[PDB]
Design an enzyme around this catalytic site. Structure first.
Site, short mmCIF file in Angstrom:
data_model
loop_
_atom_site.label_atom_id
_atom_site.label_comp_id
_atom_site.label_asym_id
_atom_site.label_seq_id
_atom_site.Cartn_x
_atom_site.Cartn_y
_atom_site.Cartn_z
N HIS A 157 0.87 -1.17 0.00
CA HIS A 157 0.00 0.00 0.00
C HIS A 157 0.90 1.21 0.00
O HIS A 157 1.73 1.36 0.90
CB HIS A 157 -0.87 -0.03 1.25
CG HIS A 157 -1.64 -1.30 1.37
ND1 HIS A 157 -2.91 -1.45 0.87
CD2 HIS A 157 -1.27 -2.52 1.83
CE1 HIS A 157 -3.31 -2.69 1.06
NE2 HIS A 157 -2.33 -3.36 1.64
N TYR A 183 3.63 8.74 10.39
CA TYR A 183 2.96 7.52 9.96
C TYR A 183 3.70 6.89 8.79
O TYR A 183 4.00 5.68 8.78
CB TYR A 183 1.51 7.85 9.59
CG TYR A 183 0.76 6.68 9.00
CD1 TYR A 183 0.44 6.64 7.64
CD2 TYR A 183 0.38 5.60 9.80
CE1 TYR A 183 -0.23 5.57 7.10
CE2 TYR A 183 -0.31 4.52 9.25
CZ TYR A 183 -0.61 4.52 7.90
OH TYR A 183 -1.29 3.47 7.34
N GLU A 186 5.98 4.71 11.22
CA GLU A 186 5.00 3.78 11.78
C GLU A 186 4.77 2.55 10.91
O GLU A 186 4.80 1.42 11.40
CB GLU A 186 3.68 4.50 12.09
CG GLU A 186 3.78 5.47 13.26
CD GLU A 186 2.50 6.23 13.49
OE1 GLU A 186 2.58 7.40 13.93
OE2 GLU A 186 1.41 5.67 13.24
#
Length: 119
Positions: free
Chosen positions: A51, A98, A102
């Site tokens: 993704h 993020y 992350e």
């Protein structure tokens, strides 16, 4: 669908594009808004699926009303088209954390430009 922000957070689900090549193409697709900084990562979910997340900081507040405006096609077989979720980045520092820390990624982050310190 409508976005009106200098700061964009894109997610291309199930997307195999190289982060650098997506970044370079988004620099042109978003050229009306004068991109200043981009970061792109390929997140791998635990099932292995990729993704691609992108943070774009533009000089100008970007009006995006065509949900297909940022679709990208890969340049080798099978020439798939990748459609992103396009959202305003509410907090660029949070979104950058993020993207760059992350999420799990086994390939390098792509970055371009000088990070904008948002008010």
């Amino acid at each position: 669908f409508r976005v009106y922000s200098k700061y964009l957070f894109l997610t291309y689900p199930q997307c195999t594009l190289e982060p650098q090549y997506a970044l370079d193409s988004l620099r042109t697709l978003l050229n009306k808004y004068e991109p200043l900084y981009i970061a792109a990562v390929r997140e791998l979910h635990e099932d292995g699926s990729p993704h691609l997340h992108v943070l774009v900081q533009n000089k100008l507040r970007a009006s995006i009303t065509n949900p297909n405006a940022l679709n990208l096609r890969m340049d080798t077989s099978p020439f798939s088209i990748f459609h992103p979720n396009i959202q305003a980045a509410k907090d660029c520092n949070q979104v950058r954390d993020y993207i760059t820390k992350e999420v799990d990624s086994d390939v390098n982050t792509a970055e371009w430009g000088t990070f904008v310190a948002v008010s």
